[PDB]
Design a protein around this ligand. Structure first.
Ligand SMILES: Cc1ncc(COP(=O)(O)O)c(/C=N/[C@@H](Cc2c[nH]c3ccccc23)C(=O)O)c1O
Ligand SMILES: Cc1ncc(COP(=O)(O)O)c(/C=N/[C@@H](Cc2c[nH]c3ccccc23)C(=O)O)c1O
Ligand code: NA
Ligand code: NA
Lengths: 395, 255, 395, 255
C-alpha cells in the first residue's frame, strides 16, 4: 500500500483476496486525486456551489441559560441532503468517475448516506443501488421516498438484525461480484483501508471550518468538541484539525440504547473487544465465542456494532474520550433543541447534544466553551419521535 | 499437511483427480451432519472442506448463509464443531480435513491457540475467508508452527506477484477460482501446492473439465449444500441423493 | 401613513377600523427599525449565523443539455426551515418583540410559513398559534409534525375550501380580538399596508445576493429571473433588486392547476379581476356578483385566489410578465430536477422551474442566461408526489 | 338619511332609546326571512340592520358565518337581497333600513352604481365592514350623492382624530363598540350622529344600561341570529321566540 492501513493495532484490509485489487486501485486513485488541482477545484466547487459549504456555526441563545457554558452548533444539518454524509459522497463520486466506474453500491441505516449517494449519482450520471435494513426502511421511511424519487434502487435487507451491519454484509457480497463496473461507496470512516482514511480526508472540512469560525467569533479554541459516533465519520471530520491542539478535548458519544447494563446498546469502543469483521480489526460487540452481537439504538444512524479504527486508536492513547448516551437522554435533547432553539436535529446528533447538556448541567458554574457537531436535521425522525412523545403525552 | 501429500501422491499414481465436497458442520443438525459426512466419504470424497458457522458470512452467498442459520438453529457452536471433528477423525484416520473459517473465529481466543486446537483434533488445513495474503503473516506462521497447511485462494484477477506469494506461503493445495490454463502453468512453475478448481463445480463435466485443464482436482463449494437444503423433509432421500451425486462427481475425476 | 400604501391603484388598508391602530403601530416600528443599526445588526446576525445566508447559486449541469440555455438556481431550499419563508419571519419576529408583543398569529398552506413562524417563536420566546386549512394539514403533513414539535399550536380550518384563504380569514378574525398582545405574522407580500412593503424589504436579500453571485460567475446580468407567485413574497424578494435593470426580464409563474379553461387554477393576476378582499385592492378570482372564488393548485403554497398588489402593478406597467404552469407541468419539472440534478424541490418552486424548461425547450438554439428562484425543498411534498407517480407507474 | 332623523326626533320626544336588531337577509330562507323581519318590526324594532351574504366574512364570528351559509344554501344572491328590500320597503314605509356590507359587494359593479341601487329600493344607510374612514372617500361621496347615510364604527381603541373624522363623515348614526361615557361626550361635542351601542347587546339590561349611559340606543348584532339558529326545526317557535325577545329588548329602551 501507498498509505499506512493501521492506526496502532487497528485497521488493516481483512477482505477476501478478490477485493484486494479494487482496494489498491481505490488507494491509488485517491493519492493521485489529492495531488490533482483539477480534482481539488471540482470538489471545492461542488461543496461550495452545490452542497452549500461553509456551514454556519450557531451560538445557542437559550439552552445554556443559568450556566457558564457557551455552546456552539456546527450546522451540518444545513448541508444539501440534510447531513454531513453529503461531503464525502461528492469526493467518492468524483473518484468513481475517475476510475471509470458507472455503478454505485452503498449501505444506509438513517438513509442519509443513501440520500447523499442518490443525489451525487443523479448529478454525476451513475447508477445507484442502496442496501437498507428492513427495520430502517420502516423507522427512517421519509429517506426511502427521497432515495426512490432521485432514481436510486433501494434494496431492503431482511437478514439478521435487519439494520446497518446486515446492509453492510450485503453490500460487500455485491461488490465481490461487481467490482469491475461498480464502486463501493462505503458510508463511514470504517471498513478496509483505504476507507477510514478517505472518509476522514473528505470530511476534514467540518473541523477546519469550525476552527476558523470559533477563532473569529471567540478569539480562542473550544474547551471541547463533541460528536456522536456510529461508524465515526462526522466525529473524525470534526476532530481531525484539532488533533494537534492538545488543549482541545475530543469527546465521541456512542449510543447507550436502553442502557449499557441491558446489553441493548451500540457502544463497542467502550464495551466491546477487538475483533476482525467488515474488513477491519477494531472494537466490536461480540459473544464469548466470537460471533458478532447485534447492536441497538433508537437512532438508525448509530445502530452499528463496531467503530472506525482511528477512533479505537485515539481512545487507546487517551487523545479522545468516549462516552455513551441513552435513548431517553437523546430524546430529551431532541425535544429541548426543538422547543428552545427552533432547530430539529437528527436523533443521532441528539446523542452528542445530550452529552453537552449533561456537561453544563452537572457543573453549572464551570466556565466552558463547547462545540457540538449537529451532524444532521431530524425530518427523517419526526414520525418516529412524534409517536413516542405521543405515547407518553409530551405531544 | 502430510495427509494432503499422501493423497496427491496416491491420486497421481492412479492418474485420478481429487473430489472435495464442502459442507457446513452441524447442518441441518449435529447427528445428521455426522451421517452426511460419513456418506460423502463412503460415496468417494477424497478430502473434506468443512465450514464452522459464523454469524455474518460476508463472503458467502445465500446457500451457505442458509446452512449457517440451520446449524445455529441446531444450537451449533465452535466448541461443538471441534467435538464433531474429533469424532470424525476417530472414524476416518487418513482423509484430509480442511476448515473454512472467518478471521474472527480464529482470532477470538488467540491465533496460536486456535491452530494448536486444530492440531489436537487432527485438522489438516485452514482457509480463512477474509484474510488476504497481505495480512496473513500471523495466521500462516501459527499454522506452520502447528503443522497446519494455510490454504490461500487464487482469484480470477490474480497477478504475477499474487501467484508468487500464494506459491510461497500456501501448503496442502491451492484454491483456484477460475487465463485458467495459464494460471495452472504459472502455479506449477512457481511450485505452488496442487491446484483445485473451486469456481462453478456443480456437475461432473466441470470436474473432468478441470482435471483435463491441468488441475489436481475440484472443490464443490455449494452443490452439496443445495442437496441438503432441498431434502430437509426427507433425510432418507437426502443421503441417497448425496451418495448418487458424490459418486458421480468422483467418477468424473478419473480423467 | 408614513409610507405609500398603494402601488398604482392596488394595495391600501381595507380592514375593520379596529385594526388601523395596529397597522399604524407596525408601520412606525418598521420605519424605526430600518434606521436602527442595532436592529440591522441583529437581523443580519440571525440571517448569517442561524438561517445560513447567503444561499448558493447553483448552475444546472444536466437539464440544459442540447440547448443554448444556462440555468442557475437560487438555493433557498438550503435555508434553515427549508424555504425562503424563513427570511421575513426573522425580521417580523424582531419587530414583534420591539413592539412588546408576546404572541404570534400566522397562517400557512405549504406549512413553510408555519414552520418558520414556529422556529422563530421558539428562538425568541414567543407563543405561536398557526391556522392551517384542513386540506393542507393532510397534503403537507410533514410540516404539521415539525410545527408541533417546536411547540406551536396548529389549528385546522375546516370552513370554505379548507385552504389558505380560509386560514387567512381565521387569522384576521383572531387578530381583531387579540391585537393587544399578539402580532399577526402575515406569510406573504399581500394583505393590508404595510405588509406588502415589509415582506418585500425582508426578502430583498434574495435578489441582492443573486445579482452579486451571477455577476461574479457570469460577469453579466441574467436575461431573466423566474419565480412562482402564490401571494408574491419569493418573487418580489428576487425581483426587487432587478427592477431598475430594464434589460432583465421578470417572470412570475402562477399555478394553472387543472388548466385555466377548467376554472380550477390559482391565477388571479392574469385571469381574475380587481376586487377588495384580505385588506387589499388587487386582482382576485371572483364570481360575477362579487363572491370570492375558490382557487385550486396541487401546490398548497400557491393555492390562493389573490395576489400581492406590487405584482398587479408591475404587470400593469409591463415591467414584469406573468404566466401559468399546470399541475402536470410542475410534476414533470419536479421529477426532472430530482433525477438529473439530485435536488428535490418544493412543488411550488417546480412551477417556476417548469416555465424555465419550457423556455429552453421551445427555442433550443436561443442563447439565454436564466435564474430560477428555488424557493424551497420538497420534503413536505414527497408523500403526495410519490402517491401520484405511483398511481401512474413512474415510481 | 331623513328616515333616521325622523326616528331620533320622535324617539327623543318619548325619551325612548332605539332598538335595532341585526339579521342576515335570506336566513334561513327567503320567505322565512321576510316573515322574521315582519315579526321584528311588529315586536317593536325601531330600525333594521340587514346583512347581505358574503363568501368570506373576515370581520364576523361563527354566528354570522353560519347565517351566511344558511342563506347561501337557500340560494340567496345580492340580486335577491335587493328584491327582498323592495318588498320590505313596500310594506314598511317609515322604518329606517341599514345594510351591513363587505367592500367587494359594493365595489363589484361600481361604487356609484351600488349606492344608486340602494336609493332606488329605499335603503337609508350602508356600513361597509372592511372600509376604514381612511379609505372611505369614494364610498362616502357616492353615498352622499345618493342620499345614503355612510355609517362608521367607533372602536374601543378610538383616538381624538378618529372621533373627529367619524363625527364629520358619518350620517344617520354612529356605531359604537364600547371610556364609554367619555366617548359619548366627545361624539356629542363633535356633533356626531346619534350613537348606538353595538358591543355586547344580548339582554335587556345592556339596553337600558346603554341608554342610561347616554347612548341614543342599542344594536343587537347577533343575539337575534342565535334565536334563528336554535329554532331552525320549529319556525313556529322561532317567530314566537323572536317576538318575546325583541319586545323585551325594546321595553328596556324606555329608560
Ligand atoms: C445525521 C447523521 N448523524 C450521524 C450519523 C452517524 O455516522 P458517523 O458515525 O459515520 O458519523 C449518521 C449516520 N449516517 C449513515 C451511517 C452509515 C452508513 N454506512 C455505514 C456503515 C457502517 C456504519 C455506519 C454507516 C447512514 O445510516 O446513512 C447520520 O446520518
Ligand atoms: C417553498 C415555497 N415556495 C413558494 C411559496 C409561494 O409563496 P409566495 O407567493 O409568497 O412566494 C411558498 C408558500 N409559502 C406560504 C404561503 C403563504 C403563507 N400565508 C399566506 C397568505 C396568503 C397567500 C400565501 C401565503 C405557506 O403556505 O406556508 C412556499 O412555501
Ligand atoms: Na458503532
Ligand atoms: Na395567488
Amino acid at each position: 500500500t501507498l498509505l499506512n492501513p493501521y492506526f496502532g493495532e487497528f485497521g488493516g484490509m481483512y477482505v477476501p483476496q478478490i477485493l484486494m485489487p479494487a482496494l489498491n486501485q481505490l488507494e491509488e486513485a485517491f493519492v493521485r486525486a489529492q495531488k490533482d488541482p483539477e480534482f481539488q477545484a471540482q470538489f471545492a466547487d461542488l461543496l461550495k456551489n452545490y452542497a452549500g459549504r461553509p456551514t454556519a456555526l450557531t451560538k445557542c441563545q437559550n439552552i445554556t441559560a443559568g450556566t457558564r457554558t457557551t455552546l456552539y452548533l456546527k450546522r451540518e444539518d444545513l448541508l444539501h441532503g440534510g447531513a454531513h454524509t453529503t461531503n464525502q459522497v461528492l469526493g467518492q463520486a468524483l473518484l468513481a468517475k475517475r476510475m471509470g466506474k458507472s455503478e454505485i453500491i452503498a449501505e444506509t441505516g438513517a438513509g442519509q448516506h443513501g440520500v447523499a449517494s442518490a443525489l451525487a449519482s443523479a448529478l454525476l450520471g451513475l447508477k445507484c443501488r442502496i442496501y437498507m435494513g428492513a427495520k430502517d426502511v420502516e423507522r427512517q421511511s421519509p429517506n426511502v421516498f427521497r432515495m426512490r424519487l432521485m432514481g436510486a434502487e433501494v434494496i431492503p435487507v431482511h437478514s439478521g438484525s435487519a439494520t446497518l451491519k446486515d446492509a453492510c454484509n450485503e453490500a460487500l457480497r455485491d461488490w465481490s461480484g461487481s467490482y469491475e463496473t461498480a464502486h463501493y461507496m462505503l458510508g463511514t470512516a470504517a471498513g478496509p483501508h483505504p476507507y477510514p482514511t478517505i472518509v476522514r480526508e473528505f470530511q476534514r472540512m467540518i473541523g477546519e471550518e469550525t476552527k476558523a469560525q470559533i477563532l473569529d467569533k471567540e478569539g480562542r479554541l473550544p474547551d471541547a468538541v463533541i460528536a456522536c459516533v456510529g461508524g465515526g465519520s462526522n466525529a473524525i471530520g470534526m476532530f481531525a484539525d484539532f488533533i494537534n491542539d492538545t488543549s482541545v478535548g475530543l469527546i465521541g458519544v456512542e449510543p447507550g440504547g436502553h442502557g449499557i447494563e441491558t446489553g441493548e446498546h451500540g457502544a463497542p469502543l467502550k464495551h466491546g473487544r477487538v475483533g476482525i469483521y467488515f474488513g477491519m480489526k477494531a472494537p466490536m460487540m461480540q459473544t464469548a465465542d466470537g460471533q458478532i452481537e447485534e447492536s441497538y439504538s433508537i437512532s438508525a444512524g448509530l445502530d452499528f456494532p463496531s467503530v472506525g479504527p482511528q477512533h479505537a486508536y485515539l481512545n487507546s492513547i487517551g487523545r479522545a474520550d468516549y462516552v455513551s448516551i441513552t435513548d431517553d437522554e437523546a430524546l430529551e435533547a431532541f425535544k429541548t433543541l426543538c422547543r428552545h432553539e427552533g432547530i430539529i436535529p437528527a436523533l443521532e446528533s441528539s446523542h452528542a447534544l445530550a452529552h453537552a447538556l449533561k456537561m453544563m448541567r452537572e457543573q453549572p458554574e464551570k466556565e466552558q466553551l463547547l462545540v457540538v457537531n449537529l451532524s444532521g436535521r431530524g425530518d427523517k425522525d419526526i414520525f418516529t419521535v412524534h409517536d413516542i412523545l405521543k405515547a407518553r403525552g409530551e405531544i | 499437511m502430510e495427509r494432503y501429500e499422501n493423497l496427491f501422491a496416491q491420486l497421481n499414481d492412479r492418474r485420478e483427480g481429487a473430489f472435495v465436497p464442502f459442507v457446513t458442520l452441524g447442518d441441518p443438525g449435529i447427528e445428521q451432519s455426522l451421517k452426511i459426512i460419513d456418506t460423502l466419504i463412503d460415496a468417494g470424497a477424497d478430502a473434506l472442506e468443512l465450514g464452522v458457522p459464523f454469524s455474518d458470512p460476508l463472503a458467502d452467498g445465500p446457500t451457505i448463509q442458509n446452512a449457517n442459520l440451520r446449524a445455529f438453529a441446531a444450537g451449533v457452536t465452535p466448541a461443538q464443531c471441534f467435538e464433531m471433528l474429533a469424532l470424525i477423525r476417530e472414524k476416518h484416520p487418513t482423509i484430509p480435513i480442511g476448515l473454512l473459517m472467518y478471521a474472527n473465529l480464529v482470532f477470538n481466543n488467540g491465533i496460536d491457540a486456535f491452530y494448536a486446537r486444530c492440531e489436537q483434533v487432527g485438522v489438516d488445513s485452514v482457509l480463512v475467508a477474509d484474510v488476504p495474503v497481505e495480512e496473513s503473516a500471523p495466521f500462516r506462521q501459527a499454522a506452520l508452527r502447528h503443522n497446519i497447511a494455510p490454504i490461500f485462494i487464487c482469484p480470477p484477477n490474480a497477478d504475477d506477484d499474487l501467484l508468487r506469494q500464494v506459491a510461497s506461503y500456501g501448503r496442502g493445495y491451492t484454491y483456484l477460482l477460475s487465463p485458467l490454463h495459464h494460471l495452472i502453468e504459472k502455479l506449477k512453475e512457481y511450485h505452488a501446492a496442487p491446484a483445485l478448481q473451486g469456481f462453478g463445480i456443480s456437475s461432473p463435466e466441470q470436474v473432468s473439465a478441470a482435471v483435463r485443464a491441468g488441475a489436481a482436482g475440484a472443490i464443490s463449494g455449494s452443490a452439496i449444500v443445495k442437496i441438503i437444503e432441498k431434502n430437509l423433509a426427507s433425510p432418507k432421500q437426502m443421503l441417497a441423493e448425496l451418495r448418487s451425486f458424490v459418486s458421480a462427481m468422483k467418477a468424473a475425476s478419473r480423467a
